[PDB]
Coordinates of C-alpha atoms and ligand atoms in Angstrom, one line a residue:
Chain B
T1 CA -10.0 157.5 73.3
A2 CA -9.2 154.2 73.5
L3 CA -11.7 151.2 72.8
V4 CA -12.1 148.0 75.9
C5 CA -14.0 145.2 74.3
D6 CA -14.9 142.4 77.4
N7 CA -14.8 139.4 74.7
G8 CA -16.9 136.7 76.8
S9 CA -18.1 133.8 76.1
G10 CA -21.9 134.6 75.6
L11 CA -22.1 138.4 75.8
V12 CA -19.9 141.0 74.2
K13 CA -19.2 144.1 76.7
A14 CA -18.0 147.0 74.2
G15 CA -17.3 150.6 74.7
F16 CA -14.9 153.8 75.5
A17 CA -12.4 154.3 78.3
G18 CA -13.7 156.7 81.2
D19 CA -17.1 155.9 80.2
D20 CA -19.4 153.9 83.3
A21 CA -21.2 151.4 81.3
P22 CA -20.3 149.5 78.2
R23 CA -22.1 151.1 75.0
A24 CA -22.5 147.8 72.9
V25 CA -24.0 144.6 75.6
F26 CA -25.4 141.7 73.1
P27 CA -24.6 137.9 72.3
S28 CA -21.4 136.3 71.5
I29 CA -23.2 134.4 68.7
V30 CA -23.5 134.2 64.9
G31 CA -26.7 132.7 63.3
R32 CA -27.2 131.5 60.1
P33 CA -30.6 130.6 58.3
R34 CA -31.0 126.2 57.9
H35 CA -34.2 126.7 56.2
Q36 CA -35.0 127.5 52.2
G37 CA -34.7 130.9 51.7
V38 CA -37.9 130.9 48.7
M39 CA -38.7 135.0 48.4
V40 CA -36.3 137.5 46.6
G41 CA -35.7 140.5 48.2
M42 CA -37.1 141.5 51.7
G43 CA -33.6 142.4 53.7
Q44 CA -32.4 139.2 53.7
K45 CA -28.4 138.3 54.5
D46 CA -26.4 135.2 54.8
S47 CA -25.6 135.5 58.3
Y48 CA -26.6 137.3 61.0
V49 CA -24.6 138.6 64.3
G50 CA -25.6 139.6 67.6
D51 CA -29.2 141.2 68.7
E52 CA -30.0 140.5 65.0
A53 CA -29.0 136.7 65.4
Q54 CA -31.3 136.5 68.3
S55 CA -34.2 138.6 66.9
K56 CA -34.1 136.0 64.1
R57 CA -33.3 132.8 66.0
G58 CA -35.9 130.8 65.3
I59 CA -35.1 130.8 61.4
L60 CA -31.5 130.1 62.2
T61 CA -28.7 127.7 63.3
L62 CA -27.2 130.0 66.1
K63 CA -23.5 129.1 67.7
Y64 CA -21.0 130.4 70.3
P65 CA -17.3 130.8 68.7
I66 CA -16.4 130.7 72.1
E67 CA -16.0 127.7 74.0
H68 CA -14.9 127.8 77.9
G69 CA -13.6 131.4 77.4
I70 CA -11.4 129.8 74.1
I71 CA -12.3 131.3 70.0
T72 CA -13.0 128.3 68.6
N73 CA -14.2 129.7 65.1
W74 CA -11.9 132.6 64.2
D75 CA -13.7 133.3 61.3
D76 CA -17.0 134.6 63.2
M77 CA -15.2 135.8 65.9
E78 CA -14.0 138.3 62.9
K79 CA -17.7 138.8 62.4
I80 CA -18.8 139.8 65.7
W81 CA -15.2 142.1 66.1
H82 CA -16.5 143.9 62.9
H83 CA -19.8 144.0 64.0
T84 CA -18.8 145.1 67.6
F85 CA -16.8 147.9 65.8
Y86 CA -18.5 149.0 62.7
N87 CA -22.1 148.5 63.3
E88 CA -22.3 148.4 67.5
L89 CA -19.7 151.2 68.6
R90 CA -19.6 152.9 65.1
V91 CA -16.2 153.3 64.9
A92 CA -12.8 152.9 62.6
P93 CA -10.6 150.5 64.8
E94 CA -8.0 152.1 63.1
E95 CA -7.8 155.3 65.0
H96 CA -8.7 153.7 68.6
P97 CA -6.4 151.5 70.9
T98 CA -7.8 148.6 71.9
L99 CA -8.1 146.9 75.6
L100 CA -9.0 143.5 75.1
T101 CA -9.2 140.1 78.0
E102 CA -9.3 137.1 78.9
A103 CA -9.1 134.6 81.6
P104 CA -6.3 133.1 82.7
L105 CA -4.8 129.7 82.3
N106 CA -5.8 129.9 78.3
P107 CA -3.7 128.6 75.2
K108 CA -1.0 130.8 73.9
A109 CA -2.5 129.8 70.4
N110 CA -5.6 132.2 71.6
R111 CA -3.8 135.5 73.1
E112 CA -1.3 135.1 69.8
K113 CA -4.3 135.0 67.2
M114 CA -6.4 137.8 69.5
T115 CA -3.2 140.0 68.2
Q116 CA -2.5 139.0 65.3
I117 CA -6.6 139.4 64.3
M118 CA -6.6 143.0 65.7
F119 CA -3.0 144.4 64.2
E120 CA -3.3 142.8 60.8
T121 CA -7.2 142.9 59.9
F122 CA -8.4 145.4 61.8
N123 CA -5.2 147.6 61.3
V124 CA -5.5 148.8 65.2
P125 CA -2.3 151.1 66.5
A126 CA -1.8 150.0 69.7
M127 CA -3.8 147.1 71.9
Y128 CA -3.6 144.7 75.0
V129 CA -4.8 141.6 76.8
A130 CA -6.5 142.2 80.1
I131 CA -7.0 138.9 82.5
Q132 CA -10.4 139.3 83.2
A133 CA -10.4 139.0 87.0
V134 CA -7.2 141.2 87.4
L135 CA -9.6 143.9 85.9
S136 CA -12.9 143.3 88.3
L137 CA -10.2 143.9 90.7
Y138 CA -10.3 148.2 89.6
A139 CA -13.8 147.9 89.0
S140 CA -14.0 147.4 93.1
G141 CA -11.6 149.8 94.0
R142 CA -9.1 147.4 95.7
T143 CA -5.6 146.6 95.8
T144 CA -6.3 143.2 97.5
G145 CA -8.8 140.4 97.1
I146 CA -9.4 137.1 95.8
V147 CA -12.1 137.4 92.4
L148 CA -14.3 134.7 91.6
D149 CA -15.2 135.5 88.3
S150 CA -18.1 133.9 86.5
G151 CA -19.1 134.4 83.3
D152 CA -21.0 132.0 80.5
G153 CA -17.8 129.8 79.9
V154 CA -15.6 129.7 82.5
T155 CA -15.1 129.8 86.2
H156 CA -12.1 131.1 87.9
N157 CA -10.3 132.2 91.1
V158 CA -7.3 134.8 90.9
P159 CA -6.1 136.2 94.2
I160 CA -4.1 139.3 94.7
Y161 CA -2.1 140.8 97.4
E162 CA -1.1 144.5 97.4
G163 CA -1.5 144.6 93.3
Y164 CA 0.7 141.5 92.9
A165 CA -1.3 138.3 91.8
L166 CA -0.2 135.2 92.5
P167 CA -0.4 132.8 89.3
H168 CA 0.2 129.7 91.2
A169 CA -2.4 129.6 93.4
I170 CA -4.8 130.8 90.9
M171 CA -7.9 128.3 90.3
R172 CA -9.9 127.5 86.9
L173 CA -13.0 125.3 86.4
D174 CA -14.6 124.9 82.9
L175 CA -18.1 125.3 84.5
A176 CA -20.1 128.3 84.2
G177 CA -23.6 129.5 82.5
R178 CA -23.3 127.9 79.5
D179 CA -23.2 124.6 81.5
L180 CA -26.0 125.5 83.9
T181 CA -28.2 126.6 80.4
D182 CA -27.3 122.9 79.1
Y183 CA -27.8 121.5 83.0
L184 CA -31.4 123.5 83.1
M185 CA -32.2 121.5 79.2
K186 CA -31.7 118.8 81.1
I187 CA -33.7 118.6 84.0
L188 CA -36.4 120.5 82.2
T189 CA -36.9 117.5 80.4
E190 CA -38.3 115.5 83.4
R191 CA -41.2 118.1 84.6
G192 CA -42.1 117.5 80.5
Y193 CA -40.6 120.2 78.8
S194 CA -38.5 119.5 75.5
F195 CA -35.8 122.4 74.5
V196 CA -33.8 120.7 71.9
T197 CA -32.6 123.9 68.9
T198 CA -29.7 125.9 69.5
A199 CA -32.9 128.6 69.3
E200 CA -34.5 127.0 72.5
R201 CA -31.3 126.8 74.4
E202 CA -31.6 131.0 74.5
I203 CA -35.3 130.4 76.2
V204 CA -33.5 128.0 78.6
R205 CA -31.2 130.8 79.2
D206 CA -33.8 132.8 79.6
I207 CA -35.9 131.2 82.4
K208 CA -32.3 130.6 84.2
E209 CA -31.5 134.2 84.9
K210 CA -35.4 135.1 85.4
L211 CA -36.2 132.6 87.8
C212 CA -33.6 130.3 88.9
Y213 CA -31.7 131.5 93.1
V214 CA -29.2 130.0 95.2
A215 CA -30.8 127.6 97.7
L216 CA -29.3 128.8 101.7
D217 CA -29.4 124.9 102.3
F218 CA -29.8 123.0 99.1
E219 CA -31.2 119.6 101.3
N220 CA -33.4 121.5 103.1
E221 CA -35.0 123.4 100.2
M222 CA -35.6 119.5 98.7
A223 CA -37.6 119.0 101.2
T224 CA -39.7 122.7 100.9
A225 CA -39.7 121.7 97.5
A226 CA -41.5 117.9 97.9
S227 CA -43.4 118.9 100.4
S228 CA -45.1 122.9 99.7
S229 CA -46.6 124.5 96.3
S230 CA -44.8 128.0 97.3
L231 CA -41.5 127.0 95.5
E232 CA -43.1 127.0 92.5
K233 CA -43.2 129.6 89.5
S234 CA -44.4 130.5 85.8
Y235 CA -43.1 131.4 82.7
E236 CA -44.8 132.7 79.3
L237 CA -42.4 130.8 76.3
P238 CA -42.1 132.7 73.2
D239 CA -45.1 130.3 71.9
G240 CA -47.2 131.7 75.1
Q241 CA -47.3 128.9 76.4
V242 CA -46.9 128.5 80.4
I243 CA -44.2 126.7 82.0
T244 CA -44.5 125.5 85.6
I245 CA -41.1 125.1 87.5
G246 CA -40.8 124.1 91.1
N247 CA -36.7 122.5 92.7
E248 CA -35.6 123.1 88.5
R249 CA -35.4 127.1 90.2
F250 CA -32.3 125.9 92.8
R251 CA -31.0 122.6 91.9
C252 CA -29.7 124.0 88.3
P253 CA -27.4 126.9 90.2
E254 CA -26.4 124.2 92.5
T255 CA -24.0 122.3 90.0
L256 CA -21.6 125.7 91.1
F257 CA -21.3 123.5 94.2
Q258 CA -22.1 120.3 93.5
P259 CA -20.6 119.9 89.7
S260 CA -20.6 116.1 89.9
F261 CA -24.8 116.8 89.0
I262 CA -23.1 117.3 85.5
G263 CA -20.4 114.5 85.9
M264 CA -17.4 117.0 86.8
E265 CA -14.8 116.0 89.5
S266 CA -14.1 118.9 90.3
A267 CA -14.0 120.5 93.8
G268 CA -17.7 123.6 94.0
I269 CA -17.0 127.3 93.5
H270 CA -17.0 127.5 97.4
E271 CA -13.9 124.9 97.5
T272 CA -11.9 126.0 94.7
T273 CA -12.0 130.0 96.4
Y274 CA -11.0 128.3 99.8
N275 CA -8.4 126.2 97.8
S276 CA -7.0 129.2 96.0
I277 CA -6.5 131.5 99.2
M278 CA -5.3 128.3 101.1
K279 CA -2.1 127.9 98.3
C280 CA -1.2 131.6 99.3
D281 CA 1.1 132.4 101.6
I282 CA 0.1 132.4 105.5
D283 CA -0.2 136.3 106.1
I284 CA -2.4 137.4 103.1
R285 CA -4.9 134.3 103.6
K286 CA -6.7 137.4 106.6
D287 CA -7.3 140.0 103.6
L288 CA -8.7 137.6 101.4
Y289 CA -11.3 136.0 103.0
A290 CA -12.2 139.8 104.1
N291 CA -12.2 140.9 100.0
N292 CA -14.0 137.8 98.1
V293 CA -14.7 139.4 95.2
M294 CA -17.7 138.3 93.3
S295 CA -17.9 139.5 89.0
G296 CA -19.5 137.8 86.2
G297 CA -23.3 137.0 85.3
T298 CA -23.3 133.6 86.8
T299 CA -22.9 135.2 90.1
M300 CA -25.5 137.2 89.4
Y301 CA -28.3 134.8 91.3
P302 CA -30.4 135.5 94.3
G303 CA -28.6 134.1 97.5
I304 CA -25.5 133.1 95.9
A305 CA -23.2 135.4 98.3
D306 CA -24.8 135.1 101.2
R307 CA -24.2 130.5 100.4
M308 CA -21.1 131.7 99.3
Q309 CA -20.9 133.4 102.6
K310 CA -21.8 130.4 104.5
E311 CA -19.8 128.1 102.6
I312 CA -16.8 129.8 103.0
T313 CA -17.4 130.7 106.4
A314 CA -17.6 126.5 107.2
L315 CA -14.2 125.9 105.6
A316 CA -12.1 128.6 107.0
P317 CA -11.5 129.1 110.9
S318 CA -13.6 130.9 112.5
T319 CA -12.1 133.8 114.5
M320 CA -11.6 136.0 111.0
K321 CA -15.0 137.5 108.8
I322 CA -15.2 136.0 105.6
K323 CA -16.9 138.7 103.2
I324 CA -18.1 138.5 100.2
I325 CA -18.3 141.3 97.7
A326 CA -20.8 141.3 95.4
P327 CA -21.6 145.0 93.8
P328 CA -24.9 145.7 91.7
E329 CA -23.1 146.2 88.7
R330 CA -20.9 143.0 88.9
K331 CA -22.3 141.7 86.0
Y332 CA -20.2 144.7 83.8
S333 CA -17.4 144.7 86.6
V334 CA -14.3 143.2 84.4
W335 CA -15.3 145.7 81.8
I336 CA -15.8 148.6 84.2
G337 CA -11.9 147.8 85.2
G338 CA -11.0 147.9 81.6
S339 CA -12.4 151.0 81.2
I340 CA -10.4 152.7 84.4
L341 CA -7.3 150.5 83.7
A342 CA -7.1 152.3 80.2
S343 CA -8.0 155.2 81.6
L344 CA -5.1 155.6 84.0
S345 CA -2.3 158.1 82.9
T346 CA 0.6 155.3 83.8
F347 CA -0.9 152.5 81.3
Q348 CA -0.2 154.2 78.2
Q349 CA 3.7 152.2 78.1
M350 CA 1.7 149.0 78.8
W351 CA -0.3 148.8 75.4
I352 CA 1.6 146.8 72.4
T353 CA 2.2 149.2 69.4
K354 CA 1.4 147.6 66.2
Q355 CA 5.5 149.4 65.6
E356 CA 6.3 146.3 68.2
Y357 CA 4.2 143.3 67.1
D358 CA 6.2 144.6 63.5
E359 CA 9.8 143.3 64.4
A360 CA 8.2 140.4 67.3
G361 CA 5.3 139.5 65.4
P362 CA 2.6 137.6 67.6
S363 CA 4.5 136.1 70.2
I364 CA 5.1 140.0 71.6
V365 CA 1.7 139.7 73.5
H366 CA 3.2 136.6 76.1
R367 CA 6.3 139.1 77.5
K368 CA 3.6 142.8 77.3
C369 CA 0.8 141.2 79.1
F370 CA 0.8 138.5 82.4
Chain Q
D1 CA -55.2 94.1 106.5
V2 CA -58.5 96.5 107.4
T3 CA -56.2 99.7 106.3
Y4 CA -55.0 97.9 102.9
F5 CA -59.1 97.2 102.7
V6 CA -60.0 100.8 103.3
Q7 CA -57.0 101.8 100.7
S8 CA -58.1 99.3 98.5
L9 CA -62.1 100.5 98.4
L10 CA -61.0 104.8 98.3
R11 CA -58.8 103.0 95.4
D12 CA -62.2 101.2 93.5
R13 CA -63.8 104.7 93.4
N14 CA -60.8 106.3 92.5
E15 CA -60.8 108.7 95.0
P16 CA -58.9 112.0 95.2
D17 CA -56.5 110.3 97.9
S18 CA -56.1 106.2 98.5
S19 CA -52.5 107.1 100.5
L20 CA -52.3 104.5 103.4
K21 CA -52.4 107.6 106.3
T22 CA -55.8 108.6 104.9
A23 CA -56.5 105.0 104.5
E24 CA -55.8 104.7 108.8
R25 CA -57.6 108.0 110.1
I26 CA -60.4 106.7 108.0
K27 CA -60.7 103.9 109.9
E28 CA -60.1 105.6 113.4
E29 CA -62.5 108.5 112.8
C30 CA -65.4 107.1 110.2
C31 CA -65.3 103.1 110.6
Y32 CA -67.5 100.9 112.7
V33 CA -69.0 97.3 113.3
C34 CA -72.8 96.6 112.3
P35 CA -75.1 93.6 112.8
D36 CA -75.2 92.6 109.3
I37 CA -73.7 93.8 106.2
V38 CA -76.7 93.6 103.6
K39 CA -78.8 95.1 106.2
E40 CA -76.5 98.0 106.3
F41 CA -76.1 98.1 102.6
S42 CA -79.6 98.6 102.4
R43 CA -79.4 101.0 105.1
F44 CA -76.9 103.3 102.8
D45 CA -80.1 102.8 100.0
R46 CA -82.6 104.6 102.9
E47 CA -80.8 106.4 104.8
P48 CA -78.5 109.6 103.1
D49 CA -76.1 111.1 105.9
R50 CA -74.5 107.4 106.3
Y51 CA -72.0 108.2 103.6
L52 CA -69.7 111.2 105.1
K53 CA -67.2 113.6 103.4
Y54 CA -63.6 113.5 104.8
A55 CA -61.0 116.2 104.0
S56 CA -57.2 115.0 103.5
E57 CA -54.4 117.5 103.2
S58 CA -51.6 115.7 100.3
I59 CA -48.0 114.7 100.6
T60 CA -47.4 118.4 98.3
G61 CA -49.6 120.1 100.7
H62 CA -52.5 121.3 99.1
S63 CA -56.4 120.0 100.5
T64 CA -58.8 117.0 98.9
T65 CA -62.1 116.1 99.9
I66 CA -62.9 112.2 99.9
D67 CA -66.7 110.9 99.8
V68 CA -66.6 107.5 102.6
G69 CA -69.2 105.1 102.0
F70 CA -70.0 101.5 102.4
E71 CA -66.4 100.4 104.0
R72 CA -67.7 102.8 106.9
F73 CA -69.0 99.2 108.1
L74 CA -67.8 96.5 105.4
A75 CA -64.0 97.0 106.4
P76 CA -64.2 96.5 110.5
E77 CA -66.7 93.1 108.4
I78 CA -63.2 91.4 107.8
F79 CA -62.9 90.7 111.9
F80 CA -66.4 88.7 111.6
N81 CA -65.5 87.5 107.8
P82 CA -62.1 87.2 107.0
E83 CA -63.3 85.6 103.7
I84 CA -63.7 89.5 102.6
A85 CA -59.9 89.9 103.8
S86 CA -57.9 86.8 102.4
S87 CA -58.1 83.3 101.3
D88 CA -56.3 81.9 103.5
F89 CA -57.6 82.2 106.7
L90 CA -62.3 81.5 106.7
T91 CA -63.2 81.3 110.8
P92 CA -64.7 84.7 111.9
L93 CA -63.7 86.2 115.0
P94 CA -66.5 84.5 117.7
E95 CA -66.1 81.2 116.0
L96 CA -62.4 81.2 116.5
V97 CA -62.6 82.7 120.5
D98 CA -65.9 79.8 120.8
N99 CA -63.0 77.2 119.2
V100 CA -60.4 78.5 122.0
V101 CA -62.9 77.6 125.1
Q102 CA -64.3 74.5 123.8
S103 CA -60.7 73.3 123.5
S104 CA -59.4 74.5 126.9
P105 CA -60.7 72.1 130.0
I106 CA -63.9 72.0 130.6
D107 CA -63.8 73.8 134.5
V108 CA -62.3 76.7 133.2
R109 CA -64.9 77.3 130.5
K110 CA -66.9 79.7 133.0
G111 CA -64.5 81.9 133.8
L112 CA -63.0 82.2 129.9
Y113 CA -66.4 83.5 129.0
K114 CA -67.2 85.6 131.9
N115 CA -64.1 87.3 131.3
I116 CA -63.5 88.2 127.2
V117 CA -60.6 91.3 127.6
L118 CA -60.0 93.0 124.3
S119 CA -56.3 94.5 123.6
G120 CA -54.8 96.6 121.0
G121 CA -55.8 99.5 119.4
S122 CA -57.6 97.7 116.6
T123 CA -60.1 96.3 119.2
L124 CA -61.8 99.9 119.6
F125 CA -63.7 99.7 116.3
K126 CA -67.5 101.4 118.1
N127 CA -70.1 98.4 118.7
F128 CA -66.8 95.6 118.2
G129 CA -66.9 94.5 121.1
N130 CA -70.8 94.3 121.2
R131 CA -70.9 92.0 117.9
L132 CA -68.5 90.0 119.4
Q133 CA -70.8 89.6 122.8
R134 CA -73.6 88.9 120.3
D135 CA -72.5 86.2 118.0
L136 CA -70.4 84.2 120.7
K137 CA -73.2 83.9 123.0
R138 CA -75.6 82.9 119.7
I139 CA -72.8 80.0 119.5
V140 CA -73.1 79.4 123.4
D141 CA -76.7 79.5 123.5
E142 CA -77.6 77.4 120.4
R143 CA -74.5 74.6 121.8
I144 CA -76.1 74.2 125.4
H145 CA -79.9 74.2 123.4
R146 CA -78.7 70.8 121.9
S147 CA -77.9 70.0 125.0
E148 CA -81.3 71.1 126.7
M149 CA -83.0 69.6 124.2
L150 CA -81.7 66.3 124.7
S151 CA -81.7 66.0 128.7
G152 CA -85.6 67.2 128.8
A153 CA -84.1 69.8 131.5
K154 CA -82.7 73.9 131.1
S155 CA -79.2 74.3 132.4
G156 CA -78.1 77.4 134.0
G157 CA -76.4 78.9 130.6
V158 CA -73.2 80.7 130.7
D159 CA -72.7 84.7 130.9
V160 CA -70.4 85.8 127.8
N161 CA -69.0 88.7 129.0
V162 CA -66.8 90.5 126.5
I163 CA -65.0 93.7 128.4
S164 CA -63.5 96.9 127.1
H165 CA -61.6 98.8 129.1
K166 CA -60.1 102.3 129.6
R167 CA -56.3 101.1 129.0
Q168 CA -57.7 98.5 126.1
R169 CA -55.6 100.5 123.4
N170 CA -51.8 99.7 125.3
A171 CA -53.0 97.3 127.7
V172 CA -50.0 95.0 126.9
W173 CA -47.6 98.2 127.8
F174 CA -49.9 98.6 131.2
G175 CA -49.5 95.1 131.6
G176 CA -45.6 94.8 131.6
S177 CA -45.4 98.2 133.5
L178 CA -47.7 96.5 136.2
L179 CA -45.8 92.9 136.1
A180 CA -42.5 94.7 136.3
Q181 CA -43.1 96.5 139.3
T182 CA -43.9 93.2 140.8
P183 CA -41.3 92.5 143.9
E184 CA -40.3 89.3 142.7
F185 CA -39.4 90.9 138.9
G186 CA -35.6 90.1 138.5
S187 CA -35.6 86.8 139.1
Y188 CA -38.0 85.9 136.0
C189 CA -35.3 87.8 133.4
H190 CA -32.5 86.4 132.1
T191 CA -29.5 88.0 133.7
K192 CA -26.8 88.8 131.3
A193 CA -24.9 86.3 134.0
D194 CA -27.0 83.4 132.5
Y195 CA -26.2 85.0 128.7
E196 CA -22.4 84.6 129.3
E197 CA -22.7 81.2 130.5
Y198 CA -25.5 79.6 127.7
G199 CA -26.1 82.2 125.3
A200 CA -28.8 83.9 123.1
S201 CA -29.5 79.6 123.4
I202 CA -30.9 80.6 127.2
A203 CA -34.1 82.3 125.5
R204 CA -34.5 79.8 122.4
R205 CA -37.4 77.4 124.6
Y206 CA -41.0 78.1 123.6
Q207 CA -42.8 79.8 127.5
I208 CA -46.5 79.8 126.0
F209 CA -46.4 76.0 124.7
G210 CA -45.8 72.4 126.1
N211 CA -42.2 71.8 124.9
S212 CA -40.6 68.3 124.4
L213 CA -37.6 67.3 126.6
Ligands
ADP401 N1 -29.0 137.3 86.4 C1 -28.4 136.6 85.9 N2 -28.9 135.3 86.6 C2 -27.9 134.2 86.3 N3 -27.6 134.0 85.0 C3 -26.9 134.9 84.5 C4 -27.5 136.3 85.2 N4 -27.2 137.1 83.7 C5 -26.6 136.8 82.7 N5 -26.3 135.1 83.0 C6 -25.7 134.0 82.7 O1 -24.0 134.4 82.7 C7 -23.6 134.6 81.6 C8 -23.4 135.7 81.1 O2 -22.5 137.0 81.9 P1 -21.5 137.5 81.5 O3 -20.0 137.7 82.9 O4 -21.3 138.4 80.4 O5 -20.6 135.8 80.3 P2 -19.2 136.1 79.9 O6 -18.6 137.5 80.0 O7 -18.5 134.9 79.9 O8 -20.0 136.3 78.8 C9 -24.6 134.0 80.4 O9 -24.3 132.6 80.5 C10 -26.1 133.3 81.6 O10 -26.6 133.1 81.4
MG402 MG1 -17.0 135.9 80.5

């Protein structure tokens, strides 16, 4: 059995090849205490990871070692991988080959450090670093499609046709669920609610995924919200205080379609999906429009597939079907795809074995992986 | 100005709604012209159903209820005591209509009092034409009686008639329609051929007033 670990910017998804869902899903977080430890005994630690850090968060400064799909803190990332293998999966990593994941257009140093740590500290026998949106296409059961993947740190489009990616047509956008969470912290302040500690950011992250949705026509939903009570919903803080919220439920996700809400110059996710299809060869575009695959947690909003279908139908020529493909399990589809790829009987020649790393060093990964 | 006064009175009572549409709708439905505001303030002590309750819906789409009180009579009083509205204008409408007819030539004064036509939406207040007629008839007969008492002989008087009519709400448009139907109408217009010669200066000269040159 191989391991599959999808190193998300916000969640680790981890498990074994050939299983149909991840065994471990937990925050991609390390927390450290920020207050006086007055009491001796009673089960304390200098640091906490994942669900322990999420449960104790009132007393901790939380941080994510991933920013925009790049590992920015390697000592904390080792603590997350150690927690993944030894606490959450309960395996010796020296006994199992591991499939890892990253975003396209990442720094080469990210992939070099990620292969080095895995051989040189976890003693893994063989490992691989797949592109996240190539794995999401395996889970969808397809050879052709353009995959919009949006997680916690990155949004990316990669078009694939008959098993070939078009690497020049790949689009990347460093705007996803962390930027939507921080923009919800911004606009909750105008309703009178202040969220500022990194623990309060996790409350706003939970408000975002229980209350926010994508408006099919934003300017009509703004008019509807300005003239109705029916738009508004309430949320219970951990304090038992109840907040109430209205147009902020669809203004937050609309940042994906209008990145200028957070002061970005970027085109929206509909425009970058169309720009990626229009960078492809003219013969493949028909099959990419019919196979717009959506994946990752920032695609889980109510109404996002319908706004995405409406907007790409407004960009494309009217004579061919735009189909947005939005599986109900699409929040895990990168990990599902890694479980398929690591289970395929043709893949076992493609692993980087430690025997290759022992002669080539960490630069082996750039010639074994896409 | 009577809407801004209604709005200002709702706002002085801190009523749940004082939006401009709600002050407008309280003029059209609740307001009327009384004989005298100190007697009518006293009637709002003597009789309790003089205060109305007005149901209004907010800009953000929920119900409210407004108590409407002395603005029912005090707001239409703006025409009959403009010192309520303004520092800059002081003469009440019945005295102002007297000043129009007494500055006008003597042979047309019976005709000008015999036919005082009301026009425009803000003349539609309940009892407005009756307050104007009685207060102007008072001004007119006090002026005639000063002359009868000097001369020792009774006059024929003058009938003051204030006229409210079925087209009063839009009388300017209905008149414009009736006058533009005339066979001669196209001869009173500026034609674009006049404008091609003289430009916008063709329309500059006052029609209603006496011009020099
Ligand atoms: N149901 C949801 N609705 C909206 N946002 C969600 C939802 N579920 C998760 N998210 C957001 O998506 C991100 C987690 O999705 P995931 O695909 O696991 O991202 P990643 O792999 O990069 O860590 C977080 O930023 C979270 O705020
Ligand atoms: Mg991710």
